[PDB]
Structure formats: structure tokens, C-alpha cells
Amino acid sequence: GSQSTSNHLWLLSDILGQGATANVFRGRHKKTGDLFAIKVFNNISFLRPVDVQMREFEVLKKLNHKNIVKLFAIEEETTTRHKVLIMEFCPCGSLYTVLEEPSNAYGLPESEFLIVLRDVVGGMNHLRENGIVHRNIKPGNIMRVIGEDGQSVYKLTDFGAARELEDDEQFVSLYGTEEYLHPDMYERAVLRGATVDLWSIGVTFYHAATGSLPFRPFEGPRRNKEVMYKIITGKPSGAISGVQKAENGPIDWSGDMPVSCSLSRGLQVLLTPVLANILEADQEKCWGFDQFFAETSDILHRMVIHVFSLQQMTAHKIYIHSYNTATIFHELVYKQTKIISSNQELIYEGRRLVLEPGRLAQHFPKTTEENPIFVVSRE
Amino acid sequence: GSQSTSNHLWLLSDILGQGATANVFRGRHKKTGDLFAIKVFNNISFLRPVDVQMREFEVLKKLNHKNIVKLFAIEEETTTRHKVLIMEFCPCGSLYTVLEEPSNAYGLPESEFLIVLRDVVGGMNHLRENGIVHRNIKPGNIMRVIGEDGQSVYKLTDFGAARELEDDEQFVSLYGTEEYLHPDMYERAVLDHQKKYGATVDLWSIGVTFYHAATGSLPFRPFEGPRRNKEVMYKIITGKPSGAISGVQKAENGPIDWSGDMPVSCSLSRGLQVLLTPVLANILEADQEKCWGFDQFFAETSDILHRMVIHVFSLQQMTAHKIYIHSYNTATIFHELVYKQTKIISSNQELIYEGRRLVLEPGRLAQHFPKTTEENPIFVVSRE
Ligand SMILES: O=C(NCCCNc1nc(Nc2cccc(NC(=O)N3CCCC3)c2)ncc1I)c1cccs1
Ligand SMILES: O=C(NCCCNc1nc(Nc2cccc(NC(=O)N3CCCC3)c2)ncc1I)c1cccs1
């Protein structure tokens, strides 16, 4: 069948998404023919507590960002009178289907990954500025939109398990007397969450970088659930992935990106610390947000100088800040090349290149994979 | 100063209750003049997420029981149009004020206590049947109402911190796929963690409440009292050896005196204490894997409520004894309970009732024993 509102119309066979509590359909405005995604809650859904039901509406009401799938309106279904959500339609689908593309079997292209990095981060920041916590971030609900400039824009959606956090202050005054409180209640209301998203993002970022999941059972994630729980909960600090090659074999843990990572070493080495800190179940040790945004911004504010090592026959991306000196450039070159700065001899556009030790990165000549700054070691 | 709605009117001076997010006032209905309690929220309270604000209302919409303060209507205040709660008014007040009665300084009388036990369990069962957790139960919240027989009825109220908890079991794959879920989320995604947790916090509060009612004292007492010294309070509640039902700080910065038993000054029969302490001990456990479930709690407490009393008097020590026994319990178990309180070996146990040696058949049921009273009790002497 079909359903509608006074402004929109959709067919139930036009499913875009299915979940425990709701479906999302592709609909059209009755007068313009403009496309929208309509989220409609199911009967099961109405058995949850009313205040829980109210959460998503309240969360989406708070958000308006380029990296959050846009809420256009809340309308009433003509027959049921049930409130539905009218949202931005993203005909390209999600980071899920992108990752299904073969060309992306060992990770997104470096530029597209950086896009993912920028947009997911921008979305998180927005959730954080609004006291929101999503709790179920996955490639499947990070939607892709081809922007004005032909470039992808990513946008978060599916805030079904989301909720607003509050500072404790409103709760505490709430209990007058403490003599009857449970220890936990006491701890919470007398003496004195969000990091769950950071974990999901960490895993999402891992998947985008490698085409693989960081933690997986030998049998695969869906089938071995016991194993999975031990892996993520028994994870050595600093580790980024743990895999089981054995039927009931031990977990091979790693602190670095796998060898087939689609990203340059330049970026791998920046990305790793970020993952290691967010993929920390112990809330004590996981990064807080202000640090997460700061470290990722530090990745995104860098420019790239393309280097090619002629002695090693390898290509390199140097992630440097526009204000960084040449001294620093050479140091970043050594970090990947293992050619001491003293022995680094450069060549640009067929002629030898010499850099004042105090020149600035934004005044280096323009480089490209096709036209890089060559390095060689001169003993 | 005063406020109003279409139907009710209250004077700001007539405050019945006062808290962080709301006040409760005594009002009258504009036509009938019937008294009611009215809960009015403060502005600060509206800074909370709307869904949180909703809860108390959505809770009170679900509840209907004799042990839960009744909701009459949700109306709007005339000047602000904010929603207010029209509630059953309880002139008598709460279990808290009852316990402020001099005669209750060492606990309630067995008769009230048993009533308090029954009602609280009844209400807590209603909450549990509706997935609710109160979270802030205390004598101050437990309202007292005179029933038709002149007997007390107790009723829960003040659901300011309450919420209705989702049963995770009811749905399949609430979260679509798990590969990206934080471990806590994964747990909820595949494992009654939240419902089992929320449940216990009310059990604890109920424990402290019953201990208070039975003794006139709080079980966990820093030397300066709970309000004065929160670090110790916490250490005591957090550091309590299992089986312990109280911890008291006798002196300043002194060690703690732990007890697994009721204090000797307790106003309850030993018959009742022996039954109550294991209940107190298993709900006053901070340890999730050690504490009782709700089901045990209900089974164990109803075990107490569905026992009959047989009044015995021991000629040995000249003392009276309440013997808590099930209508289906046998003579065998009766002499057992008697010895536990009397120390008279079962065999030496010679009984006298209404001036005649009582010969209990070996297997007859405690339902077919003589009806006793504190005034007409079975006497028991040793035949040595
Ligand atoms: O939201 C959810 N899940 C997120 C998805 C559904 N929800 C929305 N979906 C779109 N757009 C969309 C959807 C599906 C497929 C596609 N297209 C493709 O996949 N293509 C086309 C080109 C290659 C493959 C686009 N917009 C806005 C929304 I809100 C939920 C699932 C269960 C409860 S909620
Ligand atoms: O709910 C709360 N606190 C619980 C109570 C307030 N709320 C209600 N209160 C009554 N009745 C009532 C109350 C207080 C006192 C009395 N009477 C006395 O104290 N007496 C009478 C004789 C001697 C002293 C009666 N009914 C229904 C309700 I809802 C809150 C405190 C802060 C926010 S909420």
C-alpha cells in the first residue's frame, strides 16, 4: 500500500531502510515532485516507553549541519495521525555501499578517506555541541551526497538509539536525603557515556582505511558473538585490531595498519595514534572529545608535499603544516625514508632543489604524485 | 500568593513537599472544595531534555494500584499554562512522620510493620509489573492513608526520578549490526542488564526503609551522621561485608561495628526478626552478582506475609513468643520453630491449651491447630 501527509506521498514498497522500530521510505512532495526520505515508526515501536519514543524527535529537532542528514519537517500521516519524519534524501546511499565497491576492497582512496574523516568529525562535533550521543554509528548510516563541487559530502543519520545527555546537576538536587540511596545512586547523586560514539567512529575509520573490520572472529563477526565480546573487552591497550585466524585460535593483535592499507604511510602514522586512543573500552583511558577533535583537526589542517624516493623506488606523502620549516620537512622525510636529513638531496622539475632551513611549507613549489619532490641519499 | 488551574486552587504557603524540580501544594477543587495535592514544576526543571521531563507524567499515566498515590488529572496552570499534576491528597502524611512518633523511637509495632511490609511490596510489585523503577524510595515518599477499617494503608509517591525501563528481550536486533558497537553497547545489544540493575536500586532503598521501620534507626551511621560525613557513609555502604545489615561508627574516625542481625532494642518479635534479617541481608548487597533478584524478593517477602501467627508462652523463662508458620506446616515444624526460640528440645515439649495437655498429631496441619491469641496462647513447659 501507500501512505501520505498533507505535503508528501510514498509507497511502502519503496523501502530505503528497515530497523527494529521503524522504516524509511522514498517519498515525493505532492506539488513539486522533490524527493525525500520518510521515516515512519512501526507498531512494535509504540510499545516502548513514550518518553523513549520522544527522544529521536527531540534529538533531530536540535540538529542542523552539513554533516547531519537534514530534517525538513515533522508531519502527521493522513490516516494514522502518527508523526513521521521528512528528511533529506541521499540517492547515492551510504558509506556502506561505497565500501562494497570492489575498487575499495583494501580501503577508500586517500582523498575520499580524508573526506570521511572531515565529515564524520564535523558531525560528531555538532552532536557534541548539542549534548547528543548517537550510540549506533556505522557505515550503514553515514550517508553520501555528491556535493556542488562533484565531491562527496558525508552525513550522519539514524538517530534511533540517540539521546541527549545532561550535566548531573539537575539530577543531584533531585535527591534530598541520601540515607536510603543505593551505592550507585549515592555515587551519582552525592560525590559527583559519550565516548561510545568515538569507539564506533574508530571502527568505522578502520574499515574505511583498510576495507576490513578491526576485530573479527575466525568464523566471521556475525556468527561468533562470544569470541567477539572477548576480543573487544580483552584488548591490550595501544592495539588497533585483533583477529582470529584459528577456529578457536588465539587473537593476533596489531598496533599498526595492515600492510595493504590504501592510505599513504604519511597518513597511516597519523591515523594510528587516533585509533589507539579512541578504541579504548576503559573510559578512564580513552580520549575525551576535546582531545579527539584537536588531534583530528591537526590531521586535516595539514597540506601534502609529494615525495618520491628514487633509491628506494617508493612514493610518499609528507603531512606538514603550512607554517612548518624546511628543517621539519626533512625530518618528516627521514621518518619515512630513513635517510638522515644531512644526507637528503632533492630534485624538482629536472633541477636540483635547495631549501633554506627556515623556508615555509606554503612557499615550497607545488607538488603532485605525477610531479613530486624527489629525494636521494648522497653518502 | 497563590496559583490556580481550571479546576483547582492552592495557596503558595500551603507547601506539602519541596524539591529540586518541583513543589507540591495542598489545594482545593473549585467546586467540590475537595482537597488534593498538586505538583508544580520550577523553571530550572525545563532545562532538562524534554524526554526526561516527560517521564514522571508518563509513569503516573501507567500506574493504578492501592499502594501507589493516585493521579487524578493533568491540568494547566492558568497564568503559565505549564502542566501540573493533580494528585490524591494524604492528610496524615508519610511513614517518615509516623517514625517521628515517640512511641516508634525503637521501631514500629509488629502490626504496623507488617502492614508497611505488605503495602510496599504490593506497590513495588506494581512498579515491577509496569517496568518502572522509582529510584528514590524513602519513608518521606511513602504516604500514609487511613483505610475504611481505621487501619493504615501505605502508598508510594514522588516519582520525580522514576523512569520506565525497556525490556531488551522484547525486540530483536534493536541495533542492526554489531561490528561497530562500543563494548557496553555490545553487551546491551546481546545479553536483562539494565532492567536487572535498575531493579536493585529500589530493593536497596526498601531495605534501609524496612530496617528503619523495624528499629527506628538508619542502618549505616557515620559518627556525625549521614548528612555530616559523606565519605564515610559511602565507604560504609560500599565496603560492607556480605551478610552485614548495619554498620555504625561509634566514635570519631573510629572503626565500623558490623552486624548481621537486628539490634536487641528492636521492637519486633524474634519470630519476625529471624525471618526479616535474611531478606534485609540479600537486598542490602551492592554486589550485582550476589544480591537478590526481584523474584526472590517477592517470593521471600510473600513467604512472610502468608504465614499465620501462633502465640506461644514458655513457662521456662516466662516469655511470650510469636511463631510464624504456614497454614500447611506440620506439627513437626512447629516444635522446631518453638525450640529455635525456646531451646526446649522438641521432645521435652509439653503443651497446655485452655487447661488441657495438647497432643499434636505428628502430621496435622498448622491450619487445624487451635486458634490462638496473645491473650489465649498455647503454653509450653519442659517435661525434661
Ligand atoms: O536510516 C536508516 N538507514 C540509513 C539508510 C536509509 N535511511 C535514509 N536513506 C537515505 N538514502 C538512501 C537509502 C538507501 C539506499 C540509498 N541508495 C544506494 O544505496 N545506492 C544508490 C547508488 C548506489 C547504491 C539511498 N536518505 C535518508 C535516510 I533518514 C534506518 C534503518 C532502520 C531504521 S532507520
Ligand atoms: O512528593 C514529595 N514529598 C512527599 C509528600 C509531598 N507530596 C504529597 N503529599 C501528600 N500529603 C502530605 C504531604 C506532606 C505532609 C502531609 N501531612 C503532614 O505532614 N502532617 C499532617 C499531620 C502532622 C503533619 C501530607 N499527598 C500527596 C503528595 I504527591 C516531594 C517533595 C519534593 C518534590 S516532590
Curated annotation (Swiss-Prot), chain A:
Boundaries of every Ubiquitin-like domain copy: 303-379
Effect of residue 173 to A: Loss of kinase activity. No effect on dimerization. Loss of USP38-mediated degradation
Subcellular location: Cytoplasm
Numbered residues of crosslink Glycyl lysine isopeptide (Lys-Gly) (interchain with G-Cter in ubiquitin): 31
Active site as annotated: 136 (proton acceptor)
Post-translational modification: Autophosphorylation at Ser-173 activates the kinase, and is an essential step for virus-triggered signaling. Phosphorylated by IKBKB/IKKB at Ser-173. Dephosphorylated at Ser-173 by PPM1B and this negatively regulates its role in mediating antiviral response.
Effect of residue 153 to L: No effect on IFNB induction
Tissue expression pattern: Ubiquitous with higher expression in testis. Expressed in the ganglion cells, nerve fiber layer and microvasculature of the retina.
UniProt keyword annotation of Transferase present: yes
Mutagenesis / variant outcome for changing residue 349 to R: Decreases phosphorylation and kinase activity. Abolishes dimerization
Catalysed reactions, as listed in the record: L-seryl-[protein] + ATP = O-phospho-L-seryl-[protein] + ADP + H(+); L-threonyl-[protein] + ATP = O-phospho-L-threonyl-[protein] + ADP + H(+)
EC category: transferase
Assigned keywords, A-Z: Amyotrophic lateral sclerosis, Antiviral defense, ATP-binding, Coiled coil, Cytoplasm, Disease variant, Glaucoma, Host-virus interaction, Immunity, Innate immunity, Isopeptide bond, Kinase, Methylation, Neurodegeneration, Nucleotide-binding, Phosphoprotein, Serine/threonine-protein kinase, Transferase, Ubl conjugation
Effect of residue 201 to V: In IIAE8; uncertain significance
Result when mutating residue 25 to S: Loss of IFNB induction
Swiss-Prot/TrEMBL GO biological process terms: activation of innate immune response; antiviral innate immune response; canonical NF-kappaB signal transduction; cGAS/STING signaling pathway; cytoplasmic pattern recognition receptor signaling pathway; defense response to Gram-positive bacterium; defense response to virus; dendritic cell proliferation
Function: Serine/threonine kinase that plays an essential role in regulating inflammatory responses to foreign agents. Following activation of toll-like receptors by viral or bacterial components, associates with TRAF3 and TANK and phosphorylates interferon regulatory factors (IRFs) IRF3 and IRF7 as well as DDX3X. This activity allows subsequent homodimerization and nuclear translocation of the IRFs leading to transcriptional activation of pro-inflammatory and antiviral genes including IFNA and IFNB.
Name recorded for this polypeptide: Serine/threonine-protein kinase TBK1
The species this protein was found in: Homo sapiens (Human)
Lineage, opening ranks: Eukaryota, Metazoa, Chordata, Craniata, Vertebrata
Residues of the whole record sequence present: 2 to 385 of 729
